Design an enzyme around this catalytic site. Structure first.
Site, PDB file in Angstrom:
ATOM      1  CG  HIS A  53       3.676   6.043   2.490  1.00 34.49           C
ATOM      2  ND1 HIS A  53       2.861   5.654   3.531  1.00 34.49           N
ATOM      3  CD2 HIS A  53       4.892   5.505   2.740  1.00 34.49           C
ATOM      4  CE1 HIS A  53       3.552   4.900   4.367  1.00 34.49           C
ATOM      5  NE2 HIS A  53       4.788   4.794   3.912  1.00 34.49           N
ATOM      6  CG  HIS A  54       1.175  11.566  -0.623  1.00 34.19           C
ATOM      7  ND1 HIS A  54       1.400  11.663   0.734  1.00 34.19           N
ATOM      8  CD2 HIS A  54       1.849  12.595  -1.191  1.00 34.19           C
ATOM      9  CE1 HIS A  54       2.189  12.698   0.976  1.00 34.19           C
ATOM     10  NE2 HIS A  54       2.475  13.279  -0.175  1.00 34.19           N
ATOM     11  CD  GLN A 110      22.544 -17.493 -11.134  1.00 31.09           C
ATOM     12  OE1 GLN A 110      23.068 -16.395 -11.321  1.00 31.09           O
ATOM     13  NE2 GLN A 110      22.464 -18.418 -12.083  1.00 31.09           N
ATOM     14  CD  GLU A 132      19.611   6.140   1.658  1.00 34.21           C
ATOM     15  OE1 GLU A 132      19.927   7.350   1.614  1.00 34.21           O
ATOM     16  OE2 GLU A 132      18.471   5.770   1.984  1.00 34.21           O
ATOM     17  CE  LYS A 141      -3.627  -2.656   1.890  1.00 37.63           C
ATOM     18  NZ  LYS A 141      -3.675  -3.916   2.685  1.00 37.63           N
ATOM     19  CD  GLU A 169       8.510  -2.268   1.106  1.00 33.36           C
ATOM     20  OE1 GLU A 169       9.503  -2.578   1.796  1.00 33.36           O
ATOM     21  OE2 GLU A 169       7.645  -3.094   0.755  1.00 33.36           O
ATOM     22  CE  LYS A 174      16.037   7.165   1.625  1.00 35.58           C
ATOM     23  NZ  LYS A 174      15.474   7.029   2.973  1.00 35.58           N
ATOM     24  NE  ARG A 226      13.226  -3.834   2.324  1.00 32.31           N
ATOM     25  CZ  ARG A 226      13.099  -2.606   2.815  1.00 32.31           C
ATOM     26  NH1 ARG A 226      14.120  -2.021   3.419  1.00 32.31           N
ATOM     27  NH2 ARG A 226      11.942  -1.965   2.713  1.00 32.31           N
TER      28      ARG A 226
HETATM   29  N1  LIG Z   1       3.955   2.052   1.843  1.00 32.59           N
HETATM   30  C1  LIG Z   1       4.379   1.279   3.060  1.00 32.59           C
HETATM   31  N2  LIG Z   1       3.460   0.615   3.778  1.00 32.59           N
HETATM   32  C2  LIG Z   1       3.815  -0.096   4.878  1.00 32.59           C
HETATM   33  N3  LIG Z   1       5.083  -0.159   5.296  1.00 32.59           N
HETATM   34  C3  LIG Z   1       6.073   0.497   4.612  1.00 32.59           C
HETATM   35  C4  LIG Z   1       5.752   1.229   3.480  1.00 32.59           C
HETATM   36  N4  LIG Z   1       6.922   1.764   3.007  1.00 32.59           N
HETATM   37  C5  LIG Z   1       7.938   1.387   3.810  1.00 32.59           C
HETATM   38  N5  LIG Z   1       7.432   0.613   4.775  1.00 32.59           N
HETATM   39  C6  LIG Z   1       8.113  -0.004   5.868  1.00 32.59           C
HETATM   40  O1  LIG Z   1       8.755   1.010   6.622  1.00 32.59           O
HETATM   41  C7  LIG Z   1      10.032   0.539   7.012  1.00 32.59           C
HETATM   42  C8  LIG Z   1      11.082   1.372   6.337  1.00 32.59           C
HETATM   43  O2  LIG Z   1      11.106   1.320   4.978  1.00 32.59           O
HETATM   44  P1  LIG Z   1      12.482   1.409   4.251  1.00 32.59           P
HETATM   45  O3  LIG Z   1      12.238   1.366   2.760  1.00 32.59           O
HETATM   46  O4  LIG Z   1      13.379   0.225   4.647  1.00 32.59           O
HETATM   47  O5  LIG Z   1      13.112   2.724   4.814  1.00 32.59           O
HETATM   48  P2  LIG Z   1      14.011   3.745   4.079  1.00 32.59           P
HETATM   49  O6  LIG Z   1      13.165   4.837   3.489  1.00 32.59           O
HETATM   50  O7  LIG Z   1      14.885   4.438   5.191  1.00 32.59           O
HETATM   51  O8  LIG Z   1      14.813   3.048   2.987  1.00 32.59           O
HETATM   52  C9  LIG Z   1      10.126  -0.829   6.573  1.00 32.59           C
HETATM   53  O9  LIG Z   1       9.776  -1.711   7.589  1.00 32.59           O
HETATM   54  C10 LIG Z   1       9.167  -0.918   5.478  1.00 32.59           C
HETATM   55  O10 LIG Z   1       8.673  -2.216   5.372  1.00 32.59           O
HETATM   56  F1  BEF Z   2      16.685   3.550   6.983  1.00 33.58           F
HETATM   57 BE1  BEF Z   2      16.578   4.103   5.455  1.00 33.58          BE
HETATM   58  F2  BEF Z   2      17.131   3.131   4.343  1.00 33.58           F
HETATM   59  F3  BEF Z   2      17.322   5.425   5.345  1.00 33.58           F
HETATM   60 MG   LIG Z   3      16.707   2.176   2.766  1.00 28.32          MG
END
Ligand SMILES: Nc1ncnc2c1ncn2[C@@H]1O[C@H](COP(=O)(O)OP(=O)(O)O)[C@@H](O)[C@H]1O
Ligand code: BEF
Ligand SMILES: [Mg+2]
Length: 253
Positions: free
Chosen positions: A18-19, A98, A149, A16, A44, A42, A78
């Site tokens: 976010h906007h 792999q 990043e 799901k 994700e 990010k 992931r």
């Molecule tokens: N649209 C979303 N809905 C539910 N959980 C989310 C969503 N986006 C990210 N998350 C969760 O929030 C946490 C951080 O996301 P992540 O991508 O790892 O962080 P970052 O932006 O620092 O890379 C993770 O546990 C991820 O599963």
């Molecule tokens: F924890 Be996030 F990848 F900046």
């Molecule tokens: Mg990250």
């Protein structure tokens, strides 16, 4: 045309967005630059983009590149989770892992793989890569790259190794990061920023843009306004400039 993920694709992943994620995903720009706060999703969003290509464009090849091998390992994992889950509801696909190579193939067939006379139609490829291992980044021809990043990745790595992989196919790039001052990530961000004057973006509103670029900016509490206070508590025991950069997603120095 440029194919982008549907509502139905997100649902099948149990995802799901976010906007802000939604905005990033629907953009058809060849160069997308997303400046987002810590824990905003990010990585994700990166993983979801990689999965979409593997399944929605059979035969596509691409990478997620992170700054360090340890991060690449994590995000590769992931993506693997999401691919294996989606392969359940796609009988005409077969996944080949792999892991020691951070390499994944998704084989597409013309019918359920279990059924008589199944013809392999296409093989999609994904790899995790690391900027701290630039020797691994040469020789490739790709349809897409995602830099996670990005602001921690040297510019030279983008210009000399990554961008050329996109030339033959006119492939796309998603460049996503928490900012690190006014480096190349900032420069690339401005090329796609049409949101006007905004606090935390130096010289926003008077920047020149390029039509191939589209840029997105949101602090961690803007992407996830539900838990605005959780982010804001960090304000009281993290230095101002650091809070503003890491959660505010401001360009500082
Ligand atoms: N649209 C979303 N809905 C539910 N959980 C989310 C969503 N986006 C990210 N998350 C969760 O929030 C946490 C951080 O996301 P992540 O991508 O790892 O962080 P970052 O932006 O620092 O890379 C993770 O546990 C991820 O599963
Ligand atoms: F924890 Be996030 F990848 F900046
Ligand atoms: Mg990250």
């Amino acid at each position: 045309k440029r194919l982008r993920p549907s509502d139905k694709f997100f649902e099948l992943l149990g995802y799901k967005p976010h906007h802000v994620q939604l905005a990033i995903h629907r953009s058809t720009a060849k160069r997308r630059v997303a400046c987002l706060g810590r824990q905003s999703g990010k990585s994700e969003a990166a993983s979801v983009e990689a999965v979409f290509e593997l399944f929605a464009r059979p035969g596509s090849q691409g990478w997620i590149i992170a700054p360090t091998y340890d991060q690449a390992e994590i995000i590769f994992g992931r993506v693997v989770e999401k691919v294996e889950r989606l392969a359940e509801v796609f009988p005409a696909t077969e996944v080949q892992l792999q892991r020691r190579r951070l390499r994944l193939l998704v084989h597409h067939y013309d019918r359920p793989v279990n059924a008589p006379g199944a013809k392999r139609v296409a093989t999609s490829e994904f790899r995790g890569k690391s900027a701290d291992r630039p020797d691994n980044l040469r020789g490739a021809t790709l349809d897409f790259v995602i830099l996670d990043e990005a602001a921690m990745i040297p510019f030279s790595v983008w210009s000399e190794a990554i961008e050329p992989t996109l030339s033959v196919r006119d492939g796309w790039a998603l460049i996503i990061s928490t900012p690190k001052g006014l480096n190349w990530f900032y420069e690339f961000f401005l090329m796609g920023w049409r949101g006007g004057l905004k606090e935390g973006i130096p010289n926003s509103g008077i920047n020149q843009t390029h039509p191939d670029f589209e840029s997105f900016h949101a602090a961690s509490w803007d992407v996830w306004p539900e838990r605005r206070e959780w982010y804001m508590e960090r304000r009281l025991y993290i230095p101002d400039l650091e809070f503003r950069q890491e959660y505010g997603a401001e360009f500082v120095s």
